[PDB]
Amino acid sequence: SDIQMTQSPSSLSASVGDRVTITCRASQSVSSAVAWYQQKPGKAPKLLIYSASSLYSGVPSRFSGSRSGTDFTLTISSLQPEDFATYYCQQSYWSPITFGQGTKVEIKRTVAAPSVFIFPPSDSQLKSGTASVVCLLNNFYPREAKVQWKVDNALQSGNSQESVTEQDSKDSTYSLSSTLTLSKADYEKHKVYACEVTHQGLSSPVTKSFNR
Amino acid sequence: VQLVESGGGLVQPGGSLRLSCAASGFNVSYSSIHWVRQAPGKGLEWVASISSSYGYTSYADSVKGRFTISADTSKNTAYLQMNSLRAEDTAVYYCARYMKQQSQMWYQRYWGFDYWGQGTLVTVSSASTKGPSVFPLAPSSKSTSGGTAALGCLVKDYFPEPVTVSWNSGALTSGVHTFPAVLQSSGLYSLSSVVTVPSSSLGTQTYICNVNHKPSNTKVDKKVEPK
Amino acid sequence: VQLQESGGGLVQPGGSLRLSCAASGRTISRYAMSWFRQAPGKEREFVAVARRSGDGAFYADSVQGRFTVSRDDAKNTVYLQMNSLKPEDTAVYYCAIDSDTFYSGSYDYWGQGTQVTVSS
Amino acid sequence: GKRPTDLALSVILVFMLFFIMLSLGCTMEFSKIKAHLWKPKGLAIALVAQYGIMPLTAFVLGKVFRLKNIEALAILVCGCSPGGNLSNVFSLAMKGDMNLSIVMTTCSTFCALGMMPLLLYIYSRGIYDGDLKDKVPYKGIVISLVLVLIPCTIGIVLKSKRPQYMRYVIKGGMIIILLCSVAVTVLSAINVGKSIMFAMTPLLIATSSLMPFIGFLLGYVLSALFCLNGRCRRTVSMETGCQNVQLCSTILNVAFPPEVIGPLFFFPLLYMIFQLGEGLLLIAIFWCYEKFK
Ligand SMILES: C[C@H](CCC(=O)NCC(=O)O)[C@H]1CC[C@H]2[C@@H]3[C@H](O)C[C@@H]4C[C@H](O)CC[C@]4(C)[C@H]3CC[C@]12C
Ligand SMILES: C[C@H](CCC(=O)NCC(=O)O)[C@H]1CC[C@H]2[C@@H]3[C@H](O)C[C@@H]4C[C@H](O)CC[C@]4(C)[C@H]3CC[C@]12C
Ligand SMILES: CC(C)CCC[C@@H](C)[C@H]1CC[C@H]2[C@@H]3CC=C4C[C@@H](O)CC[C@]4(C)[C@H]3CC[C@]12C
Ligand SMILES: CC(C)CCC[C@@H](C)[C@H]1CC[C@H]2[C@@H]3CC=C4C[C@@H](O)CC[C@]4(C)[C@H]3CC[C@]12C
Ligand code: NA
Ligand code: NA
After folding, report:
1. Domains and CATH numbers, chain D
2. Ligand 3 atom 21 nearest Cα
3. Any coiled-coil ranges, and where (chain D)?
């Protein structure tokens, strides 16, 4: 019973001074009841534009809003270093209030290939009855990357988890780590463990492996 | 105008919890108060709304029948009561006030949210507090041989999310990457820390982790040695 | 899916050469199409990638401010406009197509490539 | 609203209704009103059709046409309100019993005070969170009943005692009604033009169009089931198809915040037009049948 609001750009890359446009599509007519919010990591959202076109008091003149039927856009004229955050699209016409998925604006930069490292499980962890194999990606841009785990040249799924850091303050790159969780028995059953990493900056996938 | 929220904490699944929103500078009775939820790693989530003067109350589909919103004119506060909480309800809850309609211009409608609270964190888990276990990530003998070698320090199975790691008691800050905590299927978090070294015999220096778990009494200093 | 490289040949240093790559057999409107170079005696190097419309284009650290890449969705062809060439750019220029939608970097089909020489 | 334009519109509307009802009072006699009260058949049929099947029809329409909570609540509230004063004009337009029409209107408006909260409590379960019981405007209902009853007595007394003046009274009423109608139309047009065109779901328009025609057909069929004369059938049909929309507008504006009433801004205005347009169409059909039968 909700009104779906589709925010087409899920992630945007821009530099300082560029012009940024974020669109929002409403599944039904919501009149001009659309508002835009800006949220920074670890803080509460801030209102920017209400009624889809009006600039809230105190917000700089760069931000703008427009409505064309069921289509709403948010525009930034000249991007500033304090404008890199996440933006949300909201509708308030119908009783169940719904938000947009979100759009994160990031600093553009040149493509850097990831550096792949692997680590065998420690002796103490093995004695504890658990085996963890971790793979590291260092200083890669953009964030879009894929990590695959191959054990005995066989694909694995559902037994690995990954986490990504924020954009670096100086290098403006990303770091990725993937952890493979296996029991003691299955770890000793197999011999070779290989992790495959694919990225836009790599012509061919690179794979690091170790011998048990 | 300020919105201050409290009452967040840790509850068992199927339990109950009540959140408060102490408003200042305006009357909650004549205003509309909304509760917005943000699950960790996801976007915003509307929950419920209250309008005391009109006797109006609305709920989202997910929380309908389990949540009850209220407002007290005497204490100038708005309450949210949560019943039969599930594991999907863990999030940071925000208190928001709708735009104030202006009588001088009867035609515009001022759709939006003016003020937000700092937010309170609610976690719904059946696990118990436990100190972390530290496992070192020893660098391999052949890991991009040259001017770069990668070390690590893995802490696992700690239930309270806040945990702090460091290297050499703050003497190492360049190349240090602390990945965000991840919630495992068992119900406990795991964290990883990685540093980069010039690989000149691993820097011919001793590297020790410094993990501090404030919700417990744990301080483990593990030295990462090459195999 | 087959891709071919257009343009190349010996040009004066500091000149401009435009390269074209026509895609046939499958629509590339919702795909990502990139470019690669192969220096003689070395491995393939990334230069530039052209994502979908509106996502933007990214360039390698070496080729910055030059080697502009643009796409023609209607013509199913991308163009790599290189300006102020240098003798260090002498290499065989290949092309790649991103099979995955989410820009993981899974290049399944590669072009035959073309030879470009920047010598006096 | 509290704008001066709205209060001026309300004042002119009150004047227009007072003079209209005074003018209609001529065709009423106390003996026939007493006779209709003494043996209630059409009155009972009208009350049954008003507060027994029309709310059910509104509920079923809300369920069939997939409508949101607020739209369904608005339709349900419109399905429980009294007939209003448009039914008297419609009953005068076609040949029908007028004493029975005023009896129906007065009895329905008086019974609403005790029947309307109960129906709201029964039916709103599942589409409204809270209590609509004390949002019912009892004072407004009583005031409307008094302002309808007074011109009846004044006009009937004028007919019974002093027939000499009543041509003058009729001509004055007929000129005052025109002078008020043009002003009210101008004010309403100004408000509609100067306000934002709030969007409305097409299903709401379909429901509001179907709703009074269902009322008319139900009234006529129910009156046909129990052997009755043509005039009684027509008057009960017009009272069963006409509903009071100001009560629904007041309840909607008092039970919801301004930011939630957006979709229902033009609903009371649209509902009035549909029953006026459909009421006049049936008047033309009946008149064309009589002359060209
Ligand atoms: C009775 C209703 C209003 C509903 C009500 O009960 N209001 C109570 C109040 O205002 O106090 C009024 C409002 C609009 C009025 C109608 C029109 O707007 C004006 C119109 C003028 C024609 O010459 C004949 C009457 C006719 C057709 C009116 C009949 C009565 C109406 C229908
Ligand atoms: C139902 C509405 C207004 C009653 C109202 O606003 N109730 C809400 C409240 O008082 O809270 C009535 C009032 C007067 C009526 C109008 C005018 O007075 C008469 C006018 C005559 C034209 O031929 C067309 C209908 C038209 C344009 C009427 C349409 C309905 C009206 C607008
Ligand atoms: C002069 C006036 C009072 C006469 C009656 C006017 C009526 C019939 C007209 C005038 C304004 C109109 C509204 C204006 C705009 C919209 C938005 C549209 O998306 C749905 C219909 C809706 C909601 C209209 C419904 C019909 C409406 C209410
Ligand atoms: C038909 C529905 C929608 C509305 C009813 C009123 C309109 C349409 C007209 C159509 C024809 C009319 C009927 C035609 C003939 C008769 C028989 C007569 O001895 C008494 C009146 C009576 C019974 C009329 C009542 C009013 C009437 C039903
Ligand atoms: Na009714
Ligand atoms: Na009537």
Report:
1. 4-292 (1.20.1530.20)
2. D200
3. none
